[PDB]
Amino acid sequence: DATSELIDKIKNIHSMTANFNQKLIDGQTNNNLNSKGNMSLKKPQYFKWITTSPNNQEIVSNGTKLWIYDGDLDQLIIKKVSNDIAQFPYLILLSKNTNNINKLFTVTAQDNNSYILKPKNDQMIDSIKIKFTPNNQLEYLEISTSLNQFTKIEFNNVKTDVDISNTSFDFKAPQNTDIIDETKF
């Protein structure tokens, strides 16, 4: 029921770009940490998350490689992509059916077009809240974790059904980047 309503909204986001503002509330340090940036998404497997302030970071996935770039360290970690929706909330936003979500999460619908996902077996994530605007646009994500951290990500300047070329999601390292390639066999 609730899972089906959520996926109907997600499956209809074929591509998207947006700005984001992130506030991270850390209970173990009692620090409130702010950041901002932009994101791009394209079904079925493309995701890009760029932090522009205060740090420079990029997470990019093309369905084959996951690139984790820290601009302040000039360091790149490369991993293989798994459809690990329990670990990566943004993979929920690429979903097209309810099969794996229902096996890994209990999903509840609430008023004002929001949904709460609670893992059935997970220690890291306590809950994921996905909120849509009345006209079914992505509005914010809230992620609560057993590290006692609460992350709220709010989207603005949302644009959908842009035509992003697939090469936009193939990361090209800057010159002299420190590489940790974890895909080598």
Swiss-Prot record:
Gene3D superfamilies referenced in this protein's UniProt entry, alphabetically: Lipoprotein localisation LolA/LolB/LppX
GO biological process, one term: lipoprotein localization to outer membrane
Domain of life: Bacteria
Subcellular location: Periplasm
Stated family: Belongs to the LolA family.
Record's subunit section: Monomer.
Summary of the function given for this chain in its UniProt record: Participates in the translocation of lipoproteins from the inner membrane to the outer membrane. Only forms a complex with a lipoprotein if the residue after the N-terminal Cys is not an aspartate (The Asp acts as a targeting signal to indicate that the lipoprotein should stay in the inner membrane).
Family annotation (PANTHER family): OUTER-MEMBRANE LIPOPROTEIN CARRIER PROTEIN
Annotated protein name in UniProt: Outer-membrane lipoprotein carrier protein
Organism this protein belongs to: Francisella tularensis subsp. tularensis (strain SCHU S4 / Schu 4)
Source taxonomy: Bacteria, Pseudomonadati, Pseudomonadota, Gammaproteobacteria, Thiotrichales
